Amino acid sequence: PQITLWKRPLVTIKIGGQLKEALLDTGADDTVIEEMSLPGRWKPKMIGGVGGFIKVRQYDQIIIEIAGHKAIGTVLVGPTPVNIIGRNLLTQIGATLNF
Amino acid sequence: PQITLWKRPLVTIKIGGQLKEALLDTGADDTVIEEMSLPGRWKPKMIGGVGGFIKVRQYDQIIIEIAGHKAIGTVLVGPTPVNIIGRNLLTQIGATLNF
Ligand SMILES: CC(C)(C)NC(=O)[C@@H]1CN(Cc2cccnc2)CCN1C[C@@H](O)C[C@@H](Cc1ccccc1)C(=O)N[C@H]1c2ccccc2C[C@H]1O
Numbered sequence: 347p348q349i350t351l352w353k354r355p356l357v358t359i360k361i362g363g364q365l366k367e368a369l370l371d372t373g374a375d376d377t378v379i380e381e382m383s384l385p386g387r388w389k390p391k392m393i394g395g396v397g398g399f400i401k402v403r404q405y406d407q408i409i410i411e412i413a414g415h416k417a418i419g420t421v422l423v424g425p426t427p428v429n430i431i432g433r434n435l436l437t438q439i440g441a442t443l444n445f
Numbered sequence: 446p447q448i449t450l451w452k453r454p455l456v457t458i459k460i461g462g463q464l465k466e467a468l469l470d471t472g473a474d475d476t477v478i479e480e481m482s483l484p485g486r487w488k489p490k491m492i493g494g495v496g497g498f499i500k501v502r503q504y505d506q507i508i509i510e511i512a513g514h515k516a517i518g519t520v521l522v523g524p525t526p527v528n529i530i531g532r533n534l535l536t537q538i539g540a541t542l543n544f
Contacts, residue, residue, distance in 0.1 A: 349542045351532040355471050370542055371472030372454055373529060378495070396477070396494020396525060415544065426495055430472060433450040441544040443448040443469055445514065445535075 357413040366429055374432030378402060378422040400424055415439035459510040465528050471542055473531030477521045499523055514538040
């Protein structure tokens with residue numbers, strides 16, 4: 347679709363078989379989802395944004411559906427304030443900014 | 446224009462008579478610019494990022510040019526790691542996310 351920005355660009359995702367709401371975030375390098383049980387091995391990671399750094403679980407090669415579009419890639423899991431779809435997966439689904 | 450997301454979507458902005466580089470950020474509600482001595486009045490604000498909150502100065506009705514497109518709105522100034530153009534100004538320049 348084409349998504350305007352008057353409201354947060356929230357979409358439904360499917361991850362681990364579960365539906366969640368997430369924010370399409372062009373300012374995020376990576377994808378980070380709130381704490382959940384997720385099938386795969388993981389390793390510790392830290393990511394930083396405004397306000398500082400958080401500790402996350404890094405899961406590689408995770409199947410995720412974003413507004414009906416398939417991606418398979420790195421998903422971080424940890425105490426993010428909101429679920430965030432970042433550029434690593436926005437690129438997979440062919441998302442661009444236009445003006 | 447169209448901007449892909451293989452790298453951070455950085456553009457040139459003009460604010461306060463100065464050129465800066467800034468990130469077009471659909472995940473950001475607000476626009477946050479690195480410390481700069483903008484004139485006049487401002488209001489204290491705290492804004493929340495992925496890692497917690499930071500202190501900023503809120504300036505209203507600020508003239509800013511984003512990739513050649515003029516606009517006007519609220520700009521938050523403080524110790525941000527990157528200059529961030531958020532939805533309050535992305536809407537003004539008619540930006541969308543497309544896939
Ligand atoms: C107005 C303000 C700027 C404070 N907003 C944000 O920071 C929001 C906060 N919400 C949360 C919120 C908090 C409170 C209230 N409402 C919402 C989550 C989404 N972010 C938007 C992010 O796109 C901001 C960027 C900024 C940044 C870019 C590059 C380098 C440093 C900082 C961000 O945090 N990106 C980082 C990022 C993000 C996810 C995964 C990995 C990484 C690395 C890095 O790219």
